[PDB]
Write an enzyme that holds these catalytic residues in place. Structure first.
Site: not given
Ligand SMILES: O=c1ccn([C@@H]2O[C@H](COP(=O)(O)O)[C@@H](O)[C@H]2O)c(=O)[nH]1
Ligand SMILES: O=c1ccn([C@@H]2O[C@H](COP(=O)(O)O)[C@@H](O)[C@H]2O)c(=O)[nH]1
Lengths: 316, 316
Positions: A60, A82, A146, A198, A218, A221
């Protein structure tokens, strides 16, 4: 041990976090503002108290590094992290012809017979993206993920900026710069986006010939997200240092809203029973140095000796 | 006391920070990654161990809040915090006619007779900006400063975004949102900028009817910069909570590179001798609620009982 900050973060939200409602509607125990730091010379922060699939974090990051935004590269690496995003888009279109799939997310976790019809539509989609070039081009492209934020920030003058490529050049010629920052937060896209990032932004720092990196996340989990997140950026810190001929420093992980979804309490509690094993070692290809042309085989993780994986329900 | 984290940050960089060279060429003792938190229900974090001019922090925040980018408003309030920026621009122009002023920054701190010729040019500039409308319009406008980044983010589609206005609307209708973020970092402007923002981005958080705010500061001057910075954002946290009918929570200050310029050591050491006095109280106009139309008189600071101010050389 090396991963203790992570376990300490879980304990703290456990006996200090207040109940806070969320977007998904699956309650959470939350804290605001936390910071952990990992000394990367002590070892790689891949959790030993739970099995974490490094292969998925590795492919990733490479996808991000290539500035790629098409699911196709991931699927080719058996990485389905994804698919949901691309699929959603396929499903909600004029060209889509099949079962409603509306809210396929909860419906799979609730309906057994739906989890097989949805599991089918997806199974086909992944193959079409893999084999149909025009399809991959239209539905396999996520657009703003990203890879493009890092390597192709679209300007108002129509051009495209390679933040990451530029910052790496800046680390080489101005090590002591206090502006080595890469942002993923664009105020004009964020209000339409499915998942505003995130991992908001990160900053590099160089001193005494060692590279450190700080990340501002921000939302997090703690049980399912954070174990992966720590590894992606610890890896990124290593790659950039390899290219810059620098040693590795620390990875500082800063948090906005750090949370534990209410249906992960039993799982997190169990993990807290386990005793951290020594941390694995990261090994990169010493001959290759252009990290943008790095590939799966250029990165090896030695001595990862984890505890069994812990299943837990994805907060839908 | 309430300000102890600040004193603890100074002590830590004092006996833990490593020497790191910088842009200004005035050495520094630096640390990377720190976080302090202030409980705003315990009082306002204006340092009592050194006199800090709240009047200057108050009129600078209001200037930001109005989305204003012209020095004129500040000058009218006897606030010269940004003159240097406008002046630089005036000096380095075709219309400028007078002494070279080249590198007026160091030359004033080195040459006594220059510090009076420069001090003069500036003295005139401030008056021309104050009285000549076309002048203020051309040289008094900084362009890209917090006021426009917060309230007029220019889009690639030519429009302008009011991040702050929008986020406040989001706090009112989606308190438990994990995306209440305002960014000041634009990848397309930053590489040309004189001062890429130090206050990169901030995030609001709401739980139990209390508003908290976290700030990511990429670079910080512990002695001269930080005392002001803590107050600007603690104030901002209060204003936004007033408008949203919320109580005040904590102000979390996160740092990238936190540093002490080498010529401030004697001063910081002395301040560490002082004993924190009780913290002042903030009082806002209860009748007015539209914080964008707030004015100097709407905000009062009660019981600020500080120690004498400590002079120190501006790292040029
Ligand atoms: O890499 C990631 C991506 C997402 N999240 C989590 O996914 C959800 C995103 O929700 P929201 O923050 O947008 O509301 C939150 O639980 C967070 C992570 O922890 N790590
Ligand atoms: O509100 C502010 C603005 C700037 N700085 C400091 O000003 C210098 C900016 O340098 P640089 O970070 O751009 O290299 C650094 O010492 C920092 C602060 O501490 N607070």
């Amino acid at each position: 041990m090396l991963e203790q900050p992570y376990l300490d973060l879980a304990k703290k939200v456990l006996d200090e976090g207040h109940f806070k409602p969320d977007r998904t509607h699956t309650g959470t125990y939350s804290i605001f503002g936390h910071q952990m730091r990992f000394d990367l010379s002590k070892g790689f922060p891949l959790l030993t108290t739970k099995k974490v699939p490094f292969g998925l974090i590795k492919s990733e990051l490479l996808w991000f590094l290539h500035g790629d935004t098409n699911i196709r590269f991931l699927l080719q690496h058996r990485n389905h992290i994804w698919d949901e995003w691309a699929f959603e888009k396929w499903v909600k279109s004029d060209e889509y012809h099949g079962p409603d799939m509306t809210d396929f997310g909860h419906r799979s976790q609730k309906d057994p017979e739906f989890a097989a019809v949805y599991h089918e539509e997806m199974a086909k989609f992944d193959d079409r993206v893999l084999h149909d070039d025009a399809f991959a081009a239209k539905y396999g492209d996520l657009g703003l993920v990203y890879g493009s934020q890092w390597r192709a920030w679209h300007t108002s003058k129509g051009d495209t900026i390679d933040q990451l490529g530029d910052v790496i050049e800046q680390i080489k010629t101005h090590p002591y710069s206090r502006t080595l920052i890469v942002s993923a937060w664009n105020p004009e896209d964020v209000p339409t986006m499915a998942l505003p990032p995130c991992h908001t932004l990160y900053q590099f720092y160089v001193n005494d010939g060692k590279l450190s990196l700080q990340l501002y996340q921000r939302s997090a989990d703690i049980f399912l997200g954070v174990p992966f997140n720590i590894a992606s950026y610890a890896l990124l810190t290593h790659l950039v240092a390899h290219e810059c001929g620098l040693e590795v420093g620390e990875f500082i992980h800063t948090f906005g809203d750090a949370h534990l979804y209410v249906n992960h309490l039993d799982q997190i509690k169990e993990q807290l029973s386990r005793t951290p094993r020594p941390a694995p070692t990261l090994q990169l290809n010493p001959d290759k140095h252009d990290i943008f042309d790095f590939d799966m085989k250029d990165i090896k993780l030695l001595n990862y000796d984890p505890y069994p994986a812990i299943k837990a329900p994805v907060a839908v």
